[PDB]
Amino acid sequence: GPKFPRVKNWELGSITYDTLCAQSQQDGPCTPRRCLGSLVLPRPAEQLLSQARDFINQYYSSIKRSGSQAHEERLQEVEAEVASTGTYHLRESELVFGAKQAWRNAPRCVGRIQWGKLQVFDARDCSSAQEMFTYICNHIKYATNRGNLRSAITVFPQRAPGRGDFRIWNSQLVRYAGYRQQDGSVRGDPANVEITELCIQHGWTPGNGRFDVLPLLLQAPDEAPELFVLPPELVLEVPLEHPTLEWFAALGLRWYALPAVSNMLLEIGGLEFSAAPFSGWYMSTEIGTRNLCDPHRYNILEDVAVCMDLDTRTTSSLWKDKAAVEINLAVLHSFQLAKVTIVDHHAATVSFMKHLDNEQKARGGCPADWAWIVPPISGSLTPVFHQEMVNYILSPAFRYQPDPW
Amino acid sequence: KFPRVKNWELGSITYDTLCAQSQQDGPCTPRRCLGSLVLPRPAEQLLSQARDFINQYYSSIKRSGSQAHEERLQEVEAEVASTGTYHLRESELVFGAKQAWRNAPRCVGRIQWGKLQVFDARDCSSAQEMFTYICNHIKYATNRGNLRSAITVFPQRAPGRGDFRIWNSQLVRYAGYRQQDGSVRGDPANVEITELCIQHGWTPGNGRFDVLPLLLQAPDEAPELFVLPPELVLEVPLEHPTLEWFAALGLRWYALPAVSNMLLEIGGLEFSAAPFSGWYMSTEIGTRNLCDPHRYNILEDVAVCMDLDTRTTSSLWKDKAAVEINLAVLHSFQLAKVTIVDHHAATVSFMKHLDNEQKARGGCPADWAWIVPPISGSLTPVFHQEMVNYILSPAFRYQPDPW
Numbered sequence: 001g002p003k004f005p006r007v008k009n010w011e012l013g014s015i016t017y018d019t020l021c022a023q024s025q026q027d028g029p030c031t032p033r034r035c036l037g038s039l040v041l042p043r044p045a046e047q048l049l050s051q052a053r054d055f056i057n058q059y060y061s062s063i064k065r066s067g068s069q070a071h072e073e074r075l076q077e078v079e080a081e082v083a084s085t086g087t088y089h090l091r092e093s094e095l096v097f098g099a100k101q102a103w104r105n106a107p108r109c110v111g112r113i114q115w116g117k118l119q120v121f122d123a124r125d126c127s128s129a130q131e132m133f134t135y136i137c138n139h140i141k142y143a144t145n146r147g148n149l150r151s152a153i154t155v156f157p158q159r160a161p162g163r164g165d166f167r168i169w170n171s172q173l174v175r176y177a178g179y180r181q182q183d184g185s186v187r188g189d190p191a192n193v194e195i196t197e198l199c200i201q202h203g204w205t206p207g208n209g210r211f212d213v214l215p216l217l218l219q220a221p222d223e224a225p226e227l228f229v230l231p232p233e234l235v236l237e238v239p240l241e242h243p244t245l246e247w248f249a250a251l252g253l254r255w256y257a258l259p260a261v262s263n264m265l266l267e268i269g270g271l272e273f274s275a276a277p278f279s280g281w282y283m284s285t286e287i288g289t290r291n292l293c294d295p296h297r298y299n300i301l302e303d304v305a306v307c308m309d310l311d312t313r314t315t316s317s318l319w320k321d322k323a324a325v326e327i328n329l330a331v332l333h334s335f336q337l338a339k340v341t342i343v344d345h346h347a348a349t350v351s352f353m354k355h356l357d358n359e360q361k362a363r364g365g366c367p368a369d370w371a372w373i374v375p376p377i378s379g380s381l382t383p384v385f386h387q388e389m390v391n392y393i394l395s396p397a398f399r400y401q402p403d404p405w
Numbered sequence: 406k407f408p409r410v411k412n413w414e415l416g417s418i419t420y421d422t423l424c425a426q427s428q429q430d431g432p433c434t435p436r437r438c439l440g441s442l443v444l445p446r447p448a449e450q451l452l453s454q455a456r457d458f459i460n461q462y463y464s465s466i467k468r469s470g471s472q473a474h475e476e477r478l479q480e481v482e483a484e485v486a487s488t489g490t491y492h493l494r495e496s497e498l499v500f501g502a503k504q505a506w507r508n509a510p511r512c513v514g515r516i517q518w519g520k521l522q523v524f525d526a527r528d529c530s531s532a533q534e535m536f537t538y539i540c541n542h543i544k545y546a547t548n549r550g551n552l553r554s555a556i557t558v559f560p561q562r563a564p565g566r567g568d569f570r571i572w573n574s575q576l577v578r579y580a581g582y583r584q585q586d587g588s589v590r591g592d593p594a595n596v597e598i599t600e601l602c603i604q605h606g607w608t609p610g611n612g613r614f615d616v617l618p619l620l621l622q623a624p625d626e627a628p629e630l631f632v633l634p635p636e637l638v639l640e641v642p643l644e645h646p647t648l649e650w651f652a653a654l655g656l657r658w659y660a661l662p663a664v665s666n667m668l669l670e671i672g673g674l675e676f677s678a679a680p681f682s683g684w685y686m687s688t689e690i691g692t693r694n695l696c697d698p699h700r701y702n703i704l705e706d707v708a709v710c711m712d713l714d715t716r717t718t719s720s721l722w723k724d725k726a727a728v729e730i731n732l733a734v735l736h737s738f739q740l741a742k743v744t745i746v747d748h749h750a751a752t753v754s755f756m757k758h759l760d761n762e763q764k765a766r767g768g769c770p771a772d773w774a775w776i777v778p779p780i781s782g783s784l785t786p787v788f789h790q791e792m793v794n795y796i797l798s799p800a801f802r803y804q805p806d807p808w
């Protein structure tokens with residue numbers, strides 16, 4: 001057979017071979033002796049030039065001008081700029097291409113069918129924390145679009161020799177406060193205790209509710225971060241109700257419309273964009289299963305099961321499973337009523353299978369992280385459960401980066 | 406450099422040092438992770454595996470370095486050097502079978518690993534004799550519904566000849582009859598073995614739940630057909646605690662999960678027929694066997710009976726029917742007093758096993774994709790647990806189909 005990984009779908013009996021993994025220049029955490037695929041956190045001079053050349057070759061292939069004179073001239077341009085300055089700069093169209101390719105390359109993203117549809121806001125002229133705030137408000141307005149959500153990324157200036165980084169300190173643009181209590185419990189979102197306490201240390205007067213929207217801590221090169229409160233009318237939220245269980249609304253639960261990740265590094269051609277927040281829309285299990293039911297998050301499973309009058313004293317009643325299903329249904333029904341874009345985990349995984357087929361023909365494979373792609377409820381009820389996946393790192397890439405404090 | 410292993414729910418960390426004892430490569434390389442793949446793509450070698458195993462055994466009985474230990478190593482060496490192979494003592498076999506189960510990265514039920522009845526069937530010389538041993542295993546393991554884990558070990562592979570083999574993938578399998586119009590009646594997973602049975606002279610049924618005969622093979626002989634006596638195969642009719650129409654679906658499952666096509670490897674010796682059995686985790690039946698689209702595929706039928714909106718994915722009709730089916734399985738097994746474990750209890754016990762193994766051995770090989778159950782993944786503690794997958798020996802392994 002072919003000397004490439006053989007990939008099988010066990011539902012359909014079909015086979016493909018991944019030839020794209022051959023383009024991986026970056027090693028993951030696995031070896032012949034042990035598989036570390038389940039680990040969440042996995043572990044320039046002429047080094048820049050080779051990454052830059054590779055990226056420029058990718059750009060010129062995507063516009064089908066590979067080997068051309070415009071291609072050879074751009075390469076020369078890039079080496080001359082690196083030769084004299086130690087760094088280089090992307091053309092506008094190269095940035096747009098690179099940002100889409102970073103998304104298309106993200107092995108943990110189930111929403112990649114959408115990858116070609118991304119509004120890239122070029123904010124590489126930004127020179128203050130105040131201006132970052134203006135750019136971020138504009139992004140939120142555009143992406144929210146009164147509930148008809150639109151994928152977007154805003155790109156701030158790249159890391160530069162000596163000079164400090166542009167950083168957004170918050171992990172997302174919208175986050176609920178988590179307030180550590182006297183008894184050691186948490187009011188609000190326990191995921192956000194640290195960022196909440198940083199906001200207070202930097203002068204934010206804290207609230208005391210379960211769904212208090214945090215301010216943003218924004219850092220321009222070589223300055224302490226500055227605190228910015230989002231105007232409330234800019235942050236679209238959806239109160240949660242259930243279509244048949246009338247008491248569910250009385251629980252006072254809610255979630256924000258716009259998932260906007262702000263702490264990842266965008267790498268393109270060896271250039272590093274340390275502030276490049278990106279947004280799309282939610283898959284309903286992110287809110288209904290993880291955010292609301294993780295024991296270390298809002299942890300509402302027992303409260304909902306009690307309201308549903310389930311037997312919470314024994315595992316074999318399946319009280320957890322029944323409650324989780326209703327909470328996910330409430331999320332879907334409430335977003336739908338509110339006319340805010342959301343996708344259920346069946347529709348999302350079906351579209352991801354279509355994406356895998358598109359990419360098989362386009363590039364000879366698709367890097368995918370099975371543990372992350374399979375949804376956290378109803379795993380084998382979705383087609384992705386039955387699909388083998390090959391995980392590898394391609395650049396352009398979204399990467400984790402250390403916290404700025 | 407050893408792997409740092411994190412639990413994300415609790416924030417706790419351990420370090421796997423056991424993985425350094427692995428001698429067999431898995432599918433992954435630094436370039437690409439192949440962890441989600443279901444299947445894998447001389448005398449001095451045997452001697453080193455033999456020694457390492459004999460060393461494991463004597464260490465387990467705390468007699469590591471005794472004259473009994475040195476003499477046994479000499480026996481193994483003398484036998485390999487003269488004949489190119491050797492034979493296990495019954496007590497070593499018992500230790501090796503338990504160790505293979507303990508080492509199985511895909512097994513969520515390993516809290517039980519020390520509790521395994523081992524039937525030595527190495528004095529078997531005919532398919533006829535294999536059938537008698539298999540019947541006694543079933544009878545013992547079933548135990549009127551009070552299920553007991555067991556393994557029966559038939560004669561090892563030998564350089565000269567064909568293997569002892571059980572052709573069926575489990576001791577209990579429902580037939581799948583392929584229609585002229587492509588479709589399947591019964592279990593679509595068993596179409597191929599069904600056809601093999603018919604071709605070897607079995608008079609087929611035409612039901613959805615027809616229990617298959619066994620195809621048993623002695624070395625270099627055609628396999629022989631053996632019908633299991635109906636009273637040996639305990640089955641559970643499926644009903645629902647509150648939905649009365651559910652019983653009307655005529656659904657049922659067998660009590661005893663007994664895997665019969667894996668190879669047991671101990672000290673470099675290979676046991677090509679070594680069927681093993683325990684009890685079911687309820688999602689195996691309620692989620693996979695009954696709801697996989699390529700298995701009995703009953704989700705739509707159940708959803709319709711529940712009057713659910715089948716027109717749209719966002720009604721979560723599939724999720725709702727699946728939960729009720731898993732509940733019907735749990736309820737019916739409990740009613741019939743047949744051992745079963747739900748996915749919550751099983752995964753909680755596996756967390757305890759991880760902790761026991763950390764203290765005992767400094768790690769535990771586990772395959773996250775197989776450990777996390779197929780419904781309600783993140784509702785179980787194993788979802789939030791990082792896991793390191795690697796191959797230790799003694800081991801259970803896949804082998805080629807004998808046809």
Ligand code: HEM
Pocket residue numbers: 099103106108109110111112114118151152153278279280281282283286343348372398
């Ligand atoms: C269009 C709608 C989209 C949907 C429904 C979606 C869905 C998801 C989901 C469910 C995850 C896993 C999140 C988690 O478990 O916390 C994810 C991961 C990710 N997605 Fe998306 N996605 C979308 C658009 C985007 C966009 C626009 C980008 C960036 C341009 C993006 C890049 C990512 C990245 C980088 C990750 C991985 C995060 C990590 O490794 O920690 N996706 N996607």
Ligand code: HEM
Pocket residue numbers: 502506509511512513514515517521554555556681682683684685686689746751775801
């Ligand atoms: C005592 C009750 C037991 C329970 C509840 C249990 C549970 C499970 C489950 C749910 C699986 C995954 C099955 C699938 O998805 O098809 C599994 C895999 C496995 N278990 Fe167990 N187990 C038990 C006892 C045993 C015993 C007695 C052995 C052998 C002595 C064993 C060895 C294995 C092996 C080798 C696999 C992997 C099969 C493969 O890789 O294809 N387990 N276990």
Ligand SMILES: N=C(Nc1cccc(CO[C@@H](CN)COCc2cccc(/N=C(/N)c3cccs3)c2)c1)c1cccs1
Pocket residue numbers: 040041111259260261263278279280281282283286400401402403
């Ligand atoms: N942040 C760190 N570690 C870390 C700590 C806790 C959790 C994690 C894992 O990150 C995920 C949180 N559990 C991030 O998930 C948020 C997310 C990401 C991507 C898409 C998401 N959902 C969407 N639907 C979209 C967001 C944007 C476009 S689509 C949500 C990582 C590190 C610091 C230094 C090195 S790593």
Ligand SMILES: N=C(Nc1cccc(CO[C@@H](CN)COCc2cccc(/N=C(/N)c3cccs3)c2)c1)c1cccs1
Pocket residue numbers: 443444514662663664681682683684685686689803804805806
């Ligand atoms: N036939 C092959 N292997 C193969 C083919 C298709 C699927 C598979 C995967 O096997 C699993 C079926 N999906 C086996 O699952 C049955 C099983 C295994 C272990 C435990 C099980 N459940 C229990 N509760 C127990 C059974 C025994 C004790 S506990 C069930 C393996 C090969 C082809 C080429 C080389 S090998």
Ligand SMILES: C[C@H](O)[C@H](O)[C@H]1CNc2nc(N)[nH]c(=O)c2N1
Pocket residue numbers: 038039040371372373413788789790791792
């Ligand atoms: C240990 C494990 O890797 C971890 O809990 C993963 C599992 N799969 C996931 N899948 C997604 N989409 N998001 C996650 O946060 C996780 N968490």
Ligand SMILES: C[C@H](O)[C@H](O)[C@H]1CNc2nc(N)[nH]c(=O)c2N1
Pocket residue numbers: 010385386387388389441442443774775776
């Ligand atoms: C492709 C994927 O690895 C495959 O569907 C696996 C996933 N996890 C599983 N987990 C268990 N316990 N049993 C299985 O058969 C599978 N199948």
Ligand SMILES: [Zn+2]
Pocket residue numbers: 030034035036037433437438439440
């Ligand atoms: Zn791996």
